[PDB]
């Protein structure tokens, strides 16, 4: 039996840590919901 536990509110935080890049990728989505890279 899976169970859920509250972890917090959903709100935008001012002064949150800013990170991560913004890649543009050609991708394919199969019938099983799996994404793969297209080259």
């Amino acid at each position: 039996d899976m169970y859920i536990e509250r972890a917090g509110d959903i709100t935008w935080e001012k002064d949150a840590e800013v990170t991560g890049n913004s890649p543009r990728l050609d991708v394919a989505l199969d019938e099983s919901g799996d994404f793969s890279l297209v080259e």
């Binding site: 899976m2 169970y3 859920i4 959903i10 935008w12 935080e13 840590e17 890649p23 990728l25 890279l37």
Partner: protein, 156 residues
């Protein structure tokens, strides 16, 4: 059970100890997560039971107690926040400018942030605090880093 709006961890006692298999969003009485987190199984909230209502393996999404309620979309220009809820760690907001997944059926926003597998289902938000999608279904690129789609359902 606890029906307060917010972000929740999805836990299981089937494996060793209590393991976090994912995360989800409770909004308007409906629990929203990714299909690969629960595989469509029923969930427990205290002494209450949450039954699946809608789900789709290809979209990799599932809703409990009612239809999918989340309909905000990334505007294609602004920074967003991943409200990451990692296993055994406190919820933390991470701001990022999404990249793009280009598909034969159109383009999708994508966030290049790497977290443990049990973080799947963590919400991605806009500046109004609205959930524009869930984190956790994506791809691994050349450098071995993870890039997740910003996966959003359809509000009927």
């Amino acid at each position: 059970g606890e029906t307060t709006d917010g972000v929740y961890r999805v836990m299981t006692r089937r494996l060793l100890g209590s393991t976090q298999v994912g995360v989800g969003v409770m909004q308007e009485g409906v629990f929203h997560t990714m299909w690969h987190v629960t595989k469509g199984a029923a969930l427990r909230s205290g002494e209450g039971r949450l039954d699946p209502y809608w789900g789709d393996v290809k979209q990799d999404l599932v809703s409990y107690c009612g239809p999918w309620k989340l309909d905000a979309a990334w505007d294609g220009l602004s920074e967003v926040q991943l409200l990451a809820v990692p296993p055994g760690e406190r919820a933390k907001n991470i701001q990022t400018l999404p990249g793009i997944f280009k598909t034969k059926d159109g383009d999708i926003g994508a966030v290049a942030l790497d977290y443990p597998a049990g973080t799947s289902g963590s919400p991605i938000l806009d500046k109004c605090g609205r959930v524009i999608g869930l984190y956790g279904n994506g791809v691994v690129i050349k450098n071995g880093s993870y890039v997740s789609a910003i996966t959003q359902g359809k509000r009927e």
